[PDB]
Amino acid sequence: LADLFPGFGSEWINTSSGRIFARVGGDGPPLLLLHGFPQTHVMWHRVAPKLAERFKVIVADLPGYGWSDMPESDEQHTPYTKRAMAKQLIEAMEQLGHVHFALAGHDRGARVSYRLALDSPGRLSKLAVLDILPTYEYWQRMNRAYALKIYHWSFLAQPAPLPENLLGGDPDFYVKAKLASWTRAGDLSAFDPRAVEHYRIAFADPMRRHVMCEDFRAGAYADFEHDKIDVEAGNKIPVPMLALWGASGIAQSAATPLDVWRKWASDVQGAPIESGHFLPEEAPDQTAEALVRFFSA
């Protein structure tokens, strides 16, 4: 596997829930970057060098993803809920001496990030979420068109071992088809092939695939319920926030994302980028610029 972060160090950070692997580089204010599904920390490799010119950049594998440890799950999928992942990453950052930091997340990692902001706003100076709406909003929008467009939320949330058994026959095909299908052009051309190999190797481990399913089970059940409590109470994130989405990504399906996020956050700005879902790989210079300017201001 290739080293896609030249000159970055590595940390394997202990927490009460297991180790978090991260690449660490740069200097300045601390900035945590969180990937999502079906990727690992390496999805930040095209923007992390530029961010490291201005920040101390921590590029972490989510709990149970990449090289982080895989806690045993339970009937409520607890360790893979975004509430639990957020708590674990807060512990990891404390091990580095970071108790107040900037945070950018994409896909599942963006869900960790906004849940972190709802549960522990004091931990964050600023927050960016990439190509997501809150989990509650995806489910509330559920109808025939959405069910057909974004089927994997309900498929991967089916009780074990059904998605695990389907994914086991030809995992390479599924993960490559997902990566391609969510890009603007619909192929793998936006990705460095060395980064694709990182994603493929992680997806080839049945234990890693089980974690991904637990993540989507949490997304169907406890994560949705946590979100429902906040929206029905009118709780809004007070942390200054940036929502970036792809004009051809998942979040924009049939919703104006900034209007959605303004219901969830009291100080949010946002913009689309011409891109499918994988903003930091499909549109690295614009994503890095948007992030550097937001976190620097």
Residue span binding its own copies (CB under 8 A) among the ranges 18-26, 57-65, 79-87, 160-168: 160-168
Partners of 272 in the beta sheet?
Answer: 245
Shortest reach from residue 182's CB to its own copies, in Å: 13
Name the nearest CA neighbour of 116 among 81, 141, 78, 158: 81
Distances (CA, A) of 37 to 33, 153, 165, 208, 292: 14, 11, 18, 11, 24
Compare residues 67 and 221 and give the one whose CB is closer to its own copies.
Answer: 221
For this structure, is 100 an active site residue? no
155 binds its own copies (CB under 8 A): yes
Cβ contact 229:145 at 8 Å: no
Residue 107 binds which one of its own copies, Cl ion, none, with CB within 5 to 8 A depending on kind? Cl ion
The count of residues interacting with its own copies (CB under 8 A) is 25
Residues 87-126 vs Cl ion: string with x where CB under 5 A?
Answer: --------------------x-------------------
Partners of 127 in the beta sheet?
Answer: 103, 241
Residue span binding its own copies (CB under 8 A) among the ranges 85-93, 113-121, 142-150, 243-251: 142-150
147 binds its own copies (CB under 8 A): yes
Which residue is catalytic, options 61, 77, 107, 223?
107
225 binds its own copies (CB under 8 A): no
Among residues 2, 99, 142, 160, the one that binds its own copies under rule CB under 8 A: 142
Residue 168 binds which one of Cl ion, its own copies, none, with CB within 5 to 8 A depending on kind? its own copies
Shortest reach from residue 209's CB to its own copies, in Å: 12
156 binds Cl ion (CB under 5 A): no
Cβ contact 45:182 at 8 Å: no
DSSP 254: T
Residue 176 token pair: 């490559």
67 binds its own copies (CB under 8 A): no
For this structure, is 107 an active site residue? yes
Compare residues 13 and 260 and give the one whose CB is closer to Cl ion.
Answer: 260
Which strand (E) or helix (H) includes residue 198? helix 193-203
224 binds its own copies (CB under 8 A): yes
Residue 230 token pair: 């906040």
Residue 263 corresponds to which amino acid? K
Which strand (E) or helix (H) includes residue 273? strand 268-273
- For residue 171, what are the contacts with CB-CB under 8 A and spacing of at least 6? 203, 204, 209
What is the distance, to the nearest Å, from the Cα of residue 265 to the centroid of all Cα atoms in its chain? 18
285 binds its own copies (CB under 8 A): no
Please count the helices (runs of H) and the strands (runs of E) in the chain.
14, 8
Sheet of 124-130: strands edge to edge? 9-13, 20-26, 56-60, 30-34, 101-106, 124-130, 241-246, 268-273
Binding site for its own copies (CB under 8 A): 139-140, 142-144, 147-148, 151, 153-155, 157-158, 162, 165-170, 173-174, 177, 220, 224
